[PDB]
Design a protein around this nucleic acid. Structure first.
Ligand SMILES: [K+]
Ligand SMILES: [K+]
Ligand SMILES: [Mg+2]
Ligand SMILES: [Mg+2]
Ligand SMILES: [Mg+2]
Ligand SMILES: [Mg+2]
Lengths: 112, 177, 188, 438, 178, 46, 179
RNA sequence: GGUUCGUUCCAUGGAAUUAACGUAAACCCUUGCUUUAUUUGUAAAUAUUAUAAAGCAGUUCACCUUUAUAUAGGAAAUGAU
């Protein structure tokens, strides 16, 4: 909740979990270098054992929003998390409806 | 080593460069002194600069060795100089000044003064004619922008009778009903 | 005040009704490879003819348009948002592209050609150019001596930029460009 | 000498020579290639697709701005109109209707096309035009007359300053206040309707849309003479009519179809096929050897050397007074135009241009209304009405057998489909509309 | 706050409630209610001047403003919508109500939206034809001939451009030498 | 639309928010027939 | 009886002139200056390619919009005044006419003629001269700090601020794991 | 009543004449051929793989059979293609 901006800054389809996933994307952007440093000290077997253990503990205390594995694309029109296409940021269905109306540039019904 | 073939040049009897020069000077001769003056008298200065640079760039030998007629689907279906911008077949021109950011719609005071100013312009240029009143309703600006004529983004209208659309309709509504 | 009977029309106007002329390359060393792409074929073929006519006036021997392989993406999606799965349909996005390669082109002249195409670019077409150029050893010193040359050319161009005295919103100059460039490109 | 790195790119010359082959086969006329902007709403290509994934969403936001932009109206206090307050929300049909926007993208700017049916101008122009000429004729006298008595002695001068003009003007306003505020009303409402299409008010909308594409947007607003020539504007109008509870659904559809005028046709000739025969008038078949070294070399005509003489025989030339005559020029601030631009007659060019355009005439019309449209406030069942006039066929291919170019792989190039969703006080309904062209 | 209430305070007062002729108008302002004294001499000089004018002219002025009211009469006349109307069936702005006759007749002076796409395409072809006939030839005045590299120019660099786009791959430089 | 209204509001132009004006119309209808929302509770239940 | 007279022929001729348009003038104009700003920003030996890479840098400072000197001179004066005064960031104008229009729109708003001397040097320092920070060669694998700076210097993914966050945390970890 | 892959076509009916959708046509891939283009693909090349824009092509011609004389059909590695 501390990562949710007090003023909404989303122009797409807003949802309880779209705000949740948008907050994780902003938190990871702010703490990716700090996180890469810890992940480097841990995997660096040339450092002292204590140094690697300190970084290994600090990486466990970082908030969950800072983990990139918790970022899952969503549909900017419907807000689902299943069936999303990276090239369009939409579900397979909203891609079909917009593709047939001509709202996705370059896409056309395939036949060969 | 050349970029094209000679099969199409030898057939016409242009195997030697001496004969190619005769064909060029005979078919693609350059403008004479008389035609340059006449051509320069009708077009303005800037246009003549493009014509002079064109005949200096495009050499007649290329037209004789590789000059081919255009049969693409994108070629222009008619001949025209394209020197000026035409009413219907060209994009509307944008020659006006930019709008004023501080301009506002006239109030009763400002509106009356302008209406008085318009009466003086048409009078200093019987009473106002139908053409003047028609211009006041459609051209006279009602904003405090010194009677500006901004650029219209409205696409050019079509002819009063579009070829291919005229003569095919008949209004069903009869004013007698 | 007499009437003159023009024997013909200006060559600039006649050349518009002939196929685009082409200069001949004496050596054939590629100086630029312009690749044009679009999702339609009609605007791609039109602008490729326009690009060849510009290369002729500049004295650049152009070659092409070479039809490069089509880039075809494919997606199969269910026709129904809910359960129905035995009914799907295929979609695609075919990218049509052409290649115009210039040979024996002067480096500066090739940049006027590219500058001209960008100013008069046709909508719906994406373009990418690879420029080649020969240079001598000692690039470090060459780029330091040309400083005074570029400064003179920019004397009249500095007017485009303007900022308050000691611009503070920028902060670290280099970090500003690196981060402002990402914001312009949308992430990368 | 030269460099070795340079020589390593000269030897790589295994090019194929341009043969200039002579065609020996007959060529047909190419298909009608419909415009590119009519296949996808956004005509764009970019190498970085980050500028390509948000377009579907922006189209919704942009269309909302444009819809609300064209609905701007003065405040009742500006025009001094007495607002008639009421709880009910009035539906306004006499405004500017707009269709979905089509955007042509470059790396430098974006051209936003939108078809509009200006219904407010039809009313304002006729209403203000009722003010007879005597108004402006008499108003001029008051100006001159007033200057003879107020700004002059009893029966431009250096003894008339603005301080006196102010008082001289207020006297006119005090006597014609009820008349000036009237003319000012229609004058401002008409000018507002006019500036919506000019840069006076569009430069502000540009600042609002420019924030979505990060490029200056140029507007190309096309004024439609009839609201039936665009499906988007049609389903919008029909939807506003049906939103009222007391709206007669079937009756409204019949009035719209009655307004649709279809051209006269011969059913037997339209549905008649075409026999494929070589067209020797096509420039491809007339000259099977396109090289000028062969055409201009005294092939058929006697001394047609000049390339222009050849072109004048093929194309229509405007520079000539006689179509197959000669180009005779005249030999011995103002606008910079040729001395013959005024004599040019674009009478047959309009025929060439507009005859090369397909799908101009309205061919067919189809309307569908589906949803909760009953008049009573209860849980009745959904309705579904369908009306049509003409046909949505692609005559060029279904009957003549010519080859067409389908849009997006499956769609006919001559039909426009648009859907508009609304809601009554009892539920939601939709209005679908098809419009075909001949 | 709370349940919103209608903003009933919305109106604009008219500067004049009834037409004041030059005589009455100047009299009201000269009553010294709210006005600068150095300006009253102007109004006072105007009032006395108006009074000095003949009587018939004053009468002519009255008739000169009555006809204007007669000329503006058809503009403020409220028009009744047609019995079977389509556009003004629910329009409550009486200013826009018109006779509605012939407002939907097709005069064969417009094509479908699909045609405008092909017409606008022609306006674009004329734009490029205009450039290729008048602006392209000027490119030849600034063109430079190609000179082959000398024995010292041994490096061959490559630079990438995306023609107005920002792409992460336009920063790479490739060099090749023998 | 709010930034559209604030942009042209300086010129004296107005435009209704059909989306928001409809939302408010719906809420007013609920309160009319006694279906609106209860009073927000600001304290724990006790 | 109230009837609207048909549009007079004079009226039609007047309306067609406004709707269809009029025969206006077109003056060709093309020079290397009218093309400057649209050219390819390549670090070639030709000064034209270097001037374009400098113009590109000024557009990134001024907001990042493309160089468009053919779509008008208007802009958003309020947004420019905010960026120029409150945010204190540069502003790029595609033409002097665009700069004068902003002065007229705003009341009592001044803009500098050009960038300061320092800003001119920073633009040429990297985008034209191409001065970099050569990543040194680290021999020992135990030089954690030196080796991190090496990789950071050889990749544009790590902005100067990103390397700061990385180095701040790294130095903290190396310090805590010592006696 | 015939005929057709087919409400296809023909003939016919003391009742029919037409419209829309589906159908059909057209479209996409594929096959042969023509023209265009030649790099980042092609051994060479006097241009033939590949690449991809447009155009043409079939049940077309020949043979055989053929109702009510109106609309047709068959033969299939040993006619052409
Ligand atoms: K770095
Ligand atoms: K082939
Ligand atoms: Mg309750
Ligand atoms: Mg029958
Ligand atoms: Mg079918
Ligand atoms: Mg090669």
């Amino acid at each position: 909740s501390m990562f949710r901006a007090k003023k909404l800054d989303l122009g797409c389809f807003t949802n309880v979990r779209v705000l949740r996933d948008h907050s994780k994307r902003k938190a990871f952007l702010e703490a990716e270098p700090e996180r890469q440093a810890l992940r480097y000290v841990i995997r660096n077997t040339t450092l002292p054992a204590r140094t690697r253990a300190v970084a290994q503990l600090q990486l466990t205390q970082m908030h969950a929003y800072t983990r990139p594995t918790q970022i899952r694309n969503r549909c900017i029109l419907g807000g689902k998390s299943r069936g999303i296409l990276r090239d369009f940021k939409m579900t397979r269905y909203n891609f079909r409806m917009n593709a047939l109306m001509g709202n996705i540039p370059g896409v056309k019904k395939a036949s060969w | 080593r050349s970029r094209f073939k000679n099969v199409r040049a030898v057939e016409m009897g242009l195997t030697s460069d001496a004969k190619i020069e005769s064909f060029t000077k005979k078919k693609f001769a350059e403008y004479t002194e008389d035609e340059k003056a006449a051509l320069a008298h009708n077009y303005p200065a800037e246009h003549m600069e493009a014509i002079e640079a064109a005949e200096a760039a495009i050499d007649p030998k290329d037209l004789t060795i590789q000059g081919r007629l255009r049969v693409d689907p994108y070629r222009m279906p008619y001949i025209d100089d394209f020197s000026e911008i035409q009413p219907i077949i060209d994009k509307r021109a944008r020659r006006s000044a930019p709008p004023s950011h501080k301009a506002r719609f006239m109030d009763v005071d400002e509106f009356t003064q302008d209406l008085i100013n318009w009466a003086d312009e048409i009078r200093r240029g019987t009473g106002p004619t139908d053409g003047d009143i028609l211009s006041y309703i459609l051209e006279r600006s009602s904003m405090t922008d010194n009677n500006l004529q901004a650029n219209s983004s409205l696409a050019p209208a079509l002819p009063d009778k579009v070829p291919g659309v005229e003569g095919k309709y008949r209004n069903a509504i009869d004013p007698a009903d | 005040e007499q009437e003159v009977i023009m024997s013909r029309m200006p060559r600039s106007l006649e050349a518009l009704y002939l196929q685009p002329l082409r200069r001949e390359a004496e050596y054939g060393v590629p100086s630029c490879d312009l690749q044009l792409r679009s999702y339609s074929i009609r605007n791609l073929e039109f602008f490729c003819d326009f690009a060849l006519r510009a290369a002729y006036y500049l004295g650049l021997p152009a070659f092409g348009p070479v039809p490069l392989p089509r880039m075809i993406e494919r997606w199969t999606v269910p026709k129904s948002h809910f359960i129905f799965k035995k009914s799907q349909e295929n979609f695609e996005r075919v990218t049509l592209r052409r290649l115009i390669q210039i040979k024996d082109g002067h480096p500066e002249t090739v940049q006027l050609w590219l500058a001209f195409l960008q100013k008069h670019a046709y909508y719906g077409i994406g373009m990418k150019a690879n420029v080649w150029e020969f240079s001598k050893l000692g690039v470090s010193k060459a780029m330091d001596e040309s400083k005074s040359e570029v400064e003179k050319l920019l004397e009249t161009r500095w007017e485009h930029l303007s900022h308050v005295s000691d611009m503070k919103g920028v902060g670290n100059f280099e970090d500003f460009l690196a981060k402002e460039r990402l914001r312009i490109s949308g992430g990368r | 000498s030269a460099s070795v790195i340079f020589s390593k790119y000269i030897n790589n010359n295994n090019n194929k020579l341009i043969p200039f082959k002579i065609k020996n086969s007959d060529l047909g006329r190419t298909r009608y290639f419909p415009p590119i902007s009519k296949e996808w709403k956004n005509s764009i290509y970019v190498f970085n697709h980050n500028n390509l994934k948000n377009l579907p969403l922006f189209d919704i936001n942009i269309n909302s701005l444009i819809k609300d932009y064209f609905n701007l109206q003065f405040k009742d206090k500006i025009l001094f109109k007495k607002k008639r307050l009421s709880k009910v929300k009035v539906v306004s049909l006499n405004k500017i209707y707009a269709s979905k926007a089509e955007i042509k993208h470059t790396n430098t700017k974006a051209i936003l096309t939108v078809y509009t049916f200006n219904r407010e101008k039809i009313s304002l122009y006729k209403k203000i035009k009722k003010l007879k000429k005597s108004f402006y004729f008499v108003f001029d006298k008051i100006i001159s007359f007033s200057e003879r008595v107020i700004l002059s002695g009893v029966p431009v001068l250096p003894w008339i300053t603005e301080s006196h003009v102010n008082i001289w003007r207020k006297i006119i306003i005090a006597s014609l206040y009820k008349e000036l505020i009237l003319l000012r009303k229609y004058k401002l409402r008409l000018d507002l309707n006019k500036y919506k299409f000019e840069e006076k008010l569009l430069y502000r909308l540009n600042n609002l849309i420019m924030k979505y594409y990060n490029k200056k947007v140029e507007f190309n607003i096309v004024n439609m003479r009839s609201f039936l020539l665009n499906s988007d504007i049609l389903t919008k109008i029909l939807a506003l009519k049906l939103k009222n509870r007391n709206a007669r659904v079937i009756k409204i559809m019949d009035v719209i179809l009655n307004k649709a005028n279809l051209p006269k046709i011969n059913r037997v000739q339209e549905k008649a096929s075409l026999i494929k025969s070589v067209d020797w008038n096509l420039l491809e078949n007339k000259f099977k050897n396109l090289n000028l070294s062969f055409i201009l070399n005294d092939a058929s005509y006697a001394e047609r050397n000049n390339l222009s003489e050849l072109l004048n025989k093929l194309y229509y030339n405007v520079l000539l007074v006689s179509q197959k005559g000669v180009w005779a020029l005249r030999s011995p601030a103002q606008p910079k135009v040729s001395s013959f631009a005024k004599a040019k007659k674009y009478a047959k060019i309009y025929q060439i241009i507009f005859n090369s355009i397909n799908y101009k005439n309205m061919g067919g019309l189809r309307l569908e209304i589906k949803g909760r449209l009953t008049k009573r406030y209860r849980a009745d069942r959904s309705l579904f009405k369908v009306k049509w006039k003409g046909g949505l066929k692609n005559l060029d291919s279904s009957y003549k057998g010519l080859s067409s170019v389908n849009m997006r792989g499956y769609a006919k190039p001559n039909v426009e489909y648009s859907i508009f969703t609304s809601k009554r006080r009892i539920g939601a309904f939709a209005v679908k509309g098809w419009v075909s062209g001949k | 706050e709370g349940v919103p209430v209608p903003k009933r305070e919305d109106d604009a007062k008219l500067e004049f409630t009834r037409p004041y002729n030059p005589g009455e108008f100047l009299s009201e302002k000269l009553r010294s209610d709210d006005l600068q004294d150095w300006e009253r001499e102007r109004y006072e000089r105007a009032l006395t001047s108006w009074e000095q004018t003949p009587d018939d002219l004053k009468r002519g002025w009255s008739t000169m403003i009555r006809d204007i009211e007669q000329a503006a009469a058809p503009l403020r006349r409220v028009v009744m919508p047609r019995r079977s109307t389509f556009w003004y069936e629910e329009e409550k702005d009486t200013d826009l109500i018109t006779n509605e006759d012939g407002e939907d007749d097709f005069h064969e002076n417009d094509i479908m939206s699909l045609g405008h796409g092909k017409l606008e395409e022609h306006r674009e072809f004329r734009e490029y034809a205009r450039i290729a006939v008048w602006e392209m030839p000027l490119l030849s005045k600034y063109a430079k001939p190609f000179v082959p590299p000398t024995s010292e120019e041994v490096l061959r660099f490559r630079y990438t451009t995306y023609m107005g786009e920002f792409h992460p791959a336009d920063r790479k430089v490739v060099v090749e030498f023998c | 639309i709010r930034e559209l209204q604030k942009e042209f509001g300086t010129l004296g132009l107005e435009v209704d928010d059909e989306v928001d004006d409809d939302r408010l119309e719906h809420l007013a209808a609920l309160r009319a027939r006694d279906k609106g929302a209860p009073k927000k509770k600001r304290t724990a239940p006790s | 009886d109230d009837y609207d007279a048909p549009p007079t022929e004079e009226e039609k001729a007047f309306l067609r002139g406004l709707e269809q348009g009029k025969v206006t003038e077109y003056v060709p104009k093309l020079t290397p200056d009218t093309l400057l700003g649209y050219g390819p920003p390549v670090a070639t030996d030709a000064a034209l390619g270097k001037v374009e890479s400098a113009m590109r840098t000024m557009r990134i400072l001024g907001g990042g919009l493309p160089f468009n000197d053919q779509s008008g001179v208007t802009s958003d004066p309020t947004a420019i005044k905010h960026r120029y005064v409150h945010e204190k960031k540069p502003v790029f104008f595609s033409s002097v006419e665009e700069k004068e229009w902003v002065r007229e729109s705003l009341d009592k708003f001044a803009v500098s003629e050009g960038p300061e001397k320092k800003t001119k040097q920073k633009i040429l320092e990297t985008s034209v001269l191409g001065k970099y920070e050569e990543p040194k060669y680290v021999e020992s694998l135990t030089e954690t700090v030196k080796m991190v700076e090496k990789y950071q210097g050889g990749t544009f993914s790590y902005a100067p601020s990103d390397a700061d966050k990385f180095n701040k945390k790294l130095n903290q970890l190396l310090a805590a794991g010592l006696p």
